[PDB]
């Protein structure tokens, strides 16, 4: 009772402080206008639903994960298939492309994160390390570098690892529901993870404890990503909405939803400038939102099934998009 | 035209050849989602047709008449399943195992089936059901204790259905209870959708053989019904 009373008092104080500093009728910023988005390439070869796709660092290679049990490295320029790794378990839910391009990580319902070295050129690709230690399904693996991965799980815990030794280094245990997506900050030191409970938390990989806790959603959080600067991040939740959390304000700024949209949001990504929030939806088409003015900006129709994957390039030229239609689509502006 | 681009198109061609070879074997295999509860003998069902031959999923590849089913039991996951079950949007069937000889937690077995049935990403998915441990039900109703009407008030004004086919030398009260239990799930099944998917209930014990042929036949029926409905022939 006393502990519960103390927690309630702390929550009341936090809410009062947050609402006190809440100082948008602003016509100064110009509208983006209608976004013209045209499919330039359509990547074909995957056998089942695309459920994970990660862009390469050179903005030309990309990795794509499909429930047929396939991790494909595509050359988005010539549409040539650079690599085709057959996964040990076909229920992959996330994939990673190491920022050096040397390694790809993938994980799924097998509770482990498999690592593959791309640059061997003796036989073919091989599994370098099978990082086990999660008791729930992996939702989002990412590379800090060639020897550190951060990994989300369906056991409510995030984990920072060390591929060389094969064991965990830090564990992050502040979430109550399943964690579905994590985004590394640009400074590559803290990551933000969103959970089935309507909460998203920061994590410093050095210490390993929550920095902030973010709420405001009404259902599961399916996808998360960082704003280009490490000062904000957007969540796409299963109650058919997106929200933007800023750390400095430590509160809500902008929520993106429509009375028409009734289905949840499966993927969220940001363009290079941060003005175009790209969100894949359950009702089969992507939508690009204008981050500043909080209005519609455009649609990406062409996918016969649910849109799972949505990744902008490092240089911002292309926008891949996977879906349950089994096709990846490279998009561009005319 | 260049030598490096020549090699690029060369191994891309080799990769697409491998991808087509993999597509042939992928589309000829049928993926099953095995579900159940702790008291429902999923493990015994798995390790009774295993002869047909920290980790977060177990895969049993079994073969009935060279159709090559891959049944994916789920171990070492959290109790929640609202998120990782959407991966099975495209499975041939969901094999649902129930232990209908307890009468206490049979209700959330019913709500579990109702949740599986009524979920999108599973609206087209047919659910096979194995009402497991029928000998437990028979011995529980033969002893005369723990009456179902205590836990289900509509079992008193329920009668054995006409279509029922009791096995010879089998008590009428036990088959009445059995078919009432089956008809509860069937009442949940024949209440939502429109011919998109159907429930296929069975009665299985712990040591029942020929259990794989049931997934085989009900998968055949699922595929036939889907085709017949797309040809407007049903």
């Amino acid at each position, epitope marked *: 009772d006393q502990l519960r009373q103390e927690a309630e008092q702390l929550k009341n104080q936090i809410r009062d402080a947050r609402k006190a500093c809440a100082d948008q009728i602003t016509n100064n910023i110009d509208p983006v206008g209608r976004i013209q988005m045209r499919t330039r390439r359509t990547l074909r070869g995957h056998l089942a639903k695309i459920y994970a796709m990660h862009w390469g660092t050179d903005s030309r290679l990309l990795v794509s994960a499909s429930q047929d049990g396939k991790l494909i490295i595509w050359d988005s320029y010539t549409t040539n298939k650079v690599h085709a790794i057959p996964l040990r378990s076909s229920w992959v839910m996330t994939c990673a492309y190491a920022p050096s391009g040397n390694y790809v990580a993938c994980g799924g319902l097998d509770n482990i994160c498999s690592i593959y070295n791309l640059k061997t050129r003796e036989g073919n690709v091989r599994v370098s390390r099978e990082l086990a230690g999660h008791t729930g399904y992996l939702s989002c693996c990412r590379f800090l570098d060639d020897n550190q991965i951060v990994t989300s799980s369906g056991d409510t815990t995030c984990a920072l690892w060390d591929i060389e030794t094969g064991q965990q280094t830090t564990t992050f245990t502040g979430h*109550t*529901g399943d964690v579905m997506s994590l985004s590394l900050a640009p400074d590559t030191r803290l990551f933000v993870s969103g*959970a*089935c*409970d*309507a909460s998203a938390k920061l994590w410093d990989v050095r210490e390993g404890m929550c920095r902030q806790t973010f*709420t405001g959603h*009404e*259902s*599961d959080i399916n996808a998360i990503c960082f704003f280009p600067n490490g000062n904000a991040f957007a969540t796409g939740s*299963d*109650d*058919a909405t997106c929200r933007l959390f800023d750390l400095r304000a430590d509160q809500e700024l902008m929520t993106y939803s429509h009375d028409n949209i*009734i289905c*949840g949001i499966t993927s969220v990504s940001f363009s290079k400038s941060g003005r175009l929030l790209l969100a894949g939806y359950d009702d089969f088409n992507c939508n690009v939102w204008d981050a500043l003015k909080a209005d519609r900006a455009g649609v990406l129709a062409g996918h016969d099934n649910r849109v799972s994957c949505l990744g902008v390039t490092d240089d911002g030229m292309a926008v891949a998009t996977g879906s349950w239609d089994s096709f990846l689509k490279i998009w561009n502006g005319s | 035209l260049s030598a490096e681009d020549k090699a690029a198109v060369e191994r891309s061609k080799m990769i697409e050849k491998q991808l087509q070879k993999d597509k042939q074997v992928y589309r000829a295999t049928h993926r099953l989602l095995l579900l159940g509860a702790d008291n429902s003998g999923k493990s015994t069902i798995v390790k009774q047709m295993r002869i047909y031959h920290t980790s977060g999923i177990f895969e049993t590849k079994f073969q009935v008449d060279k159709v090559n089913f891959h049944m994916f039991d789920v171990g070492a996951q959290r*109790d*929640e*399943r*609202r998120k990782w079950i959407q991966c099975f949007n495209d499975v041939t069937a969901i094999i649902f195992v129930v232990d209908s000889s307890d009468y*206490n*937690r049979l*209700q*959330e077995a019913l*709500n579990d089936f*109702k*949740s*599986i*049935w*009524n*979920n*999108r990403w599973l609206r087209t998915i047919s659910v096979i059901l194995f009402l497991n441990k029928q000998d437990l039900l028979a011995e529980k109703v033969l002893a005369g204790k723990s009456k179902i009407e*205590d*836990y*289900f*008030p*509509e079992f008193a004004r329920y009668t054995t259905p006409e279509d029922a086919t009791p096995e010879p030398g089998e008590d009428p009260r036990v088959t009445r209870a059995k078919y009432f239990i089956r008809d509860e799930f069937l009442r949940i099944s024949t209440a*939502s959708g429109d011919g998109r998917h159907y429930c296929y209930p069975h009665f299985t014990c712990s040591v029942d053989t020929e259990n794989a042929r049931r997934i085989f036949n009900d998968c055949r029926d699922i595929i036939q019904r889907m085709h017949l409905r797309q040809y407007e022939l049903l």
Partner: nanobody, 126 residues
Framework: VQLQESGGGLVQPGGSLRLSCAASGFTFSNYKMNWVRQAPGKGLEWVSDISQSGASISYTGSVKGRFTISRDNAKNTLYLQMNSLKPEDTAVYYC?????????????????????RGQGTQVTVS
């Protein structure tokens, strides 16, 4: 998101009670709702069920006819009227939402941990 369940107490068998659950942080009207009870020495069992706007109502077999459930989406408060008690009803009662709106099935209300469930009200029968 926080669901607060009111009422609860010790009542002699055959008494009456009113369980009022107040929900905040979401549009109450779009979500199917449930009552789940946990008895001492047993796991959580689902008890009552009401759809988005009272279109459908359901109960477990041991509770059919006796207890009743209604919605107050205007007041954002769900109500369970309790009468004709039994010694087996001594338990903690939780008002459970279910994950996604506009949805006709609800997952993981009976689970050991649910992302957002009420603290619970204890009801005891003499």
């Amino acid at each position: 998101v926080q669901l607060q369940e009111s009422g609860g107490g010790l009542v002699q068998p055959g008494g009456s009670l009113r369980l009022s659950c107040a929900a905040s942080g979401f549009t109450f009207s779009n979500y199917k709702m449930n009552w789940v009870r946990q008895a001492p020495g047993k796991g959580l069992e689902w008890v009552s069920d009401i759809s988005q706007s009272g279109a459908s109502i359901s109960y477990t077999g041991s509770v059919k006819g006796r207890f009743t459930i209604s919605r107050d989406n205007a007041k954002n408060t769900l109500y369970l009227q309790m009468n004709s008690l039994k010694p087996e009803d001594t338990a903690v009662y939780y008002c459970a939402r279910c994950p996604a709106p506009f949805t006709r099935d609800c997952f993981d209300v009976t689970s050991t941990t649910y992302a957002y469930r009420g603290q619970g009200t204890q009801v005891t029968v003499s």
